[PDB]
UniProtKB/Swiss-Prot annotation, chain B:
This is Small ubiquitin-related modifier 2. There is a cross-link at residue 7 (Glycyl lysine isopeptide (Lys-Gly) (interchain with G-Cter in SUMO2)). The gene is SUMO2. It is found in: Nucleus; Nucleus, PML body. It comes from the Eukaryota. Keywords: Acetylation, Host-virus interaction, Isopeptide bond, Nucleus, Ubl conjugation, Ubl conjugation pathway. Broadly expressed. The keyword Cell cycle does not apply. Changing residue 21 to E: Significantly impairs sumoylation of MTA1. The keyword Nucleus applies. One of its GO terms (biological process) is protein sumoylation. Its main location: nucleus. The chain holds residues 15 to 89 of 95 of the full protein. Polymeric SUMO2 chains undergo 'Lys-6'-, 'Lys-11'-, 'Lys-48'- and 'Lys-63'-linked polyubiquitination by RNF4. Interacts with SAE2 and UBE2I. Interacts with ZNF451. Identified in a complex with ZNF451 and UBE2I/UBC9, where one ZNF451 interacts with one UBE2I/UBC9 and two SUMO2 chains, one bound to the UBE2I/UBC9 active site and the other to another region of the same UBE2I/UBC9 molecule. Covalently attached to a number of proteins. Interacts with PELP1. Interacts with USP25; the interaction sumoylates USP25. Interacts with SIMC1, CASP8AP2, RNF111 and SOBP (via SIM domains). Interacts with MTA1. Interacts with HINT1. (Microbial infection) Interacts with Epstein-barr virus BGLF4.
Length: 91, 75
């Protein structure tokens, strides 16, 4: 799960968004864990991604937890879906 | 409170979690899993506790609990 390329894409997204919002310079390394949760009980159907990723903070490798929200559930739509980084923090 | 979270675990080691209503027929879940993954439905089989799942079965009827797992594999 955590090494799929769509997960890597969302992980990079989370890191990029975190860097813009906080004026930071974390550098993405790898995803260590990823839970994908599709919510079928509401409209619009949305997916929450809970990513545990590794990123370099000035040469030090650290662990971060990110929540990425996506307005969609089809993988084929994921590239163009609206997305939001809703939480980014050290684990 | 009529909501339940189910893990759908595939033979490829992937896991996708779904929030569904407990009295919704599980066909909705099964169709969503296939569409999401790009899978054809004719191929694959869903199992819960080693047994097959009717399209009309609901989580309540199967006495499913929050965080239970549905196994999916192809024929």
């Amino acid at each position: 799960n955590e090494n799929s390329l769509e997960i890597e894409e969302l992980a990079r997204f989370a890191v990029d968004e975190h860097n813009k919002k906080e004026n930071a310079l974390l550098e993405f390394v790898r995803v260590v864990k990823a839970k994908e949760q599709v919510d079928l009980t509401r409209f619009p159907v949305t997916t929450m991604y809970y990513l545990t990723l590794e990123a370099k903070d000035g040469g030090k490798k650290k662990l971060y937890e990110a929540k990425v929200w996506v307005k969609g559930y089809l993988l084929e739509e994921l590239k163009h879906n609206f997305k939001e980084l809703q939480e980014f923090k050290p684990v | 409170n009529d909501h339940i979270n189910l893990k759908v675990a595939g033979q490829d080691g992937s896991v996708v979690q779904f929030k569904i209503k407990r009295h919704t027929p599980l066909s909705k879940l099964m169709k969503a899993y296939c569409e999401r993954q790009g899978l054809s439905m004719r191929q694959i089989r869903f199992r819960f506790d080693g047994q097959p799942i009717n399209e009309t079965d609901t989580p309540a009827q199967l006495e499913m609990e929050d965080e239970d797992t549905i196994d999916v594999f192809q024929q």
